[PDB]
Amino acid sequence: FDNSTYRNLQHHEYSTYTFLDLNVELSKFRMPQPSSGRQSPRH
Amino acid sequence: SNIVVSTRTGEVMRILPRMHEDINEEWISDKTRFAYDGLKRQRLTQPMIRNEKGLLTYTTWEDALSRVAGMLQSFQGNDVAAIAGGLVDAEALVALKDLLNRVDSDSLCTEEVFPTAGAGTDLRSNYLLNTTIAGVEEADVILLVGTNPRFEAPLFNARIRKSWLHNDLKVALIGSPVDLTYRYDHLGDSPKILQDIASGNHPFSQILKEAKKPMVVLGSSALQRSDGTA
Known about the structure:
The structure is cut from a larger assembly and holds chains A (43 residues) and B (230 residues).
Chain A: H1 18-26
Chain B: E1 3-7, E2 12-17, H1 30-34, E3 48-50, E4 56-58, H2 61-74, E5 81-84, H3 90-102, E6 107-110, E7 141-145, H4 149-152, H5 154-166, E8 170-174, E9 185-188, H6 192-199, H7 203-209, E10 214-218, H8 220-223
Parallel strand pairs in B: 5-6, 7-8, 7-10, 8-9
Antiparallel strand pairs in B: 1-2, 3-4
C-alpha cells in the first residue's frame, strides 16, 4: 500500500491522434447503429 | 400571382406580394417583382406607318386605322390571320376573334402549341392543371414530364417543395436532371420511358399503383416539340 505516488502518467505519452486511434480501435465492439430510414434530412 | 402595384404621381414605384392562400401565398418570383422597370423602356407610344422610303414614322390614330381598315376590307376568309402573344388579355382576344370572324376568318392562333388531336381544346379539363396549386398539398406522389417547374412556374415549384418538406411528398421527373431545390427521383430523359411506365414494366408503375393521391404534371414546354401529341 502507498498513497505517495500519483500513478496517472499515461497522458504524458499521448500524441495528437491518440483519441482518434482509440476511437478506431473501439469501432470494432460497437453495436449496429439505428437508422431513421433516410440518407439525410434532405433526402 | 396576386400583387400590389405601388404608384406615386402617375408612375409605378414597385411590385409587392398580395396574400392569396390558394395561389402564391405571400411570395412572388423575382421576375414578377423586378421586371416592372422594363415598362419604362422601349415603349410604343404613337401609331406608326411606313413612309415612301419604307421607314416607320409617327402618324395619327385616324390615318393608321384607315389604312388597316382598307386592307381589312379588301381581304377576307383565309387571307386574314392573327397571332396572339404571351401577355394578351381575354377582352382583346375576344374582340380580335369577333373582328376576324366578321371577315369569315378562323386563322386566329397563338404562339404556344397545344395538340389539337382528339378532344383538343374541346374539353377544358384536357389543357388545365386540374389538381390545382392548392392540391399539391394533398398529394403524395408527383411525376413531372419534360418541364422545369422551378423556372416555368416558381410559385408552383415552391408549393411542391412545401409539400415535399411537410407532407413527405415523393417527386419523380422525366427529363434533363435540372436542379429543383429539393431531392427527386430521376427516371431519365427518354420519352419512351413514358411508354414503359404506361405498360407497367417500370417500378414507378407500381409506385403510382399504390399511391392514394397520385399526380402527373406535363409542362406545356414539352408540348412545343413535334412529338407532343404523342
